[PDB]
């Protein structure tokens, strides 16, 4: 079966920094692909480099998770997608000076409302700038609550990338390098392969 | 009658810096629209902020010249644009250390050979890094050139900006800022607007 998956997020899914706004979805479309995965990435944006065969996404630079919520049941009414990426909030701590646990789980709740047969991700940063960590530490105890409930709500650490500020940050300092996307991917595909390996089969 | 317009560039098309990569676009489409003409902008790639209309464009992030005629035939025929908003030539500078006024030229004369009765304008830079004056010298001639022969080309001199670095340049100090896009968006329309009405006409 092919799967349709919608990265949801901000300038981190866009893809700002290194990498030709692919983001991790370059090389993610790769490992899954390898996996012997049909993947369609789906959302109305599209933007990558020209190695990434689907370039689709609702990846938004600049947005916070209102923004994303205020938008977000059209998104997936119009794309209906099998599983969502949502990786979103840096914007709320970073733009907002709000700490938004409400918000992220609130948008959780929303996206279910929407589309209850959904399987949903929700990640956490690499931990740059150091204040992002602060943000980092609310989000698995919020998807536990929620998992615990049953609901199809799975967490992914991208925290634990092994970070190093000299090859996984791009010229802007602040996103991502290509290097650093590429962790990310692997982080990605190391939480959801299991998951989307059930679900195509 | 609707003008299809094909915005084509790098990161400064794609809208890399300030402006939820809209670019120029967004304050442009707005200007167009204002004037009482139907723009229809061409593209696969898709970016901008809510308030964009119509986000489809060819900008790549990070892209040179070569790059864009490497693929410019296809998007032209796939696209079948009535103008073309031409923006190249500085990753060729920066990133490749060419200065590619022979680029530039061919690159005209290409879109030319496949779209004989396309309208093409073309840019050249604000004056940020400084570095990219040298390449901005070249490209009226270039341009002249070409309209003296009978082609349909138009210089646009986006590097009369009245550049201000401390508001015109975003957060990644080198790409615009939405103030500095906006004032993009002005010098577009300027040198655009009446062959625009008259193709409209
Ligand atoms: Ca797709
Ligand atoms: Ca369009």
Redesign the interface.
Known sequence: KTIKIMPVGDSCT?G?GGG??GSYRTELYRLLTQAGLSIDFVG????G??SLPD?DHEG????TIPQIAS?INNWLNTHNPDVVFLWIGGNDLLLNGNLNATGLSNLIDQIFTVKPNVTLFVADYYPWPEAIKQYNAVIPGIVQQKANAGKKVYFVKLSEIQFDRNTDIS????HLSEIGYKKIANIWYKYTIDILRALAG
């Open positions: 866009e700002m030709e706004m109305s944006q599209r933007s480099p020209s370039k938004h630079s600049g947005w938008n010229w802007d300092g602040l």
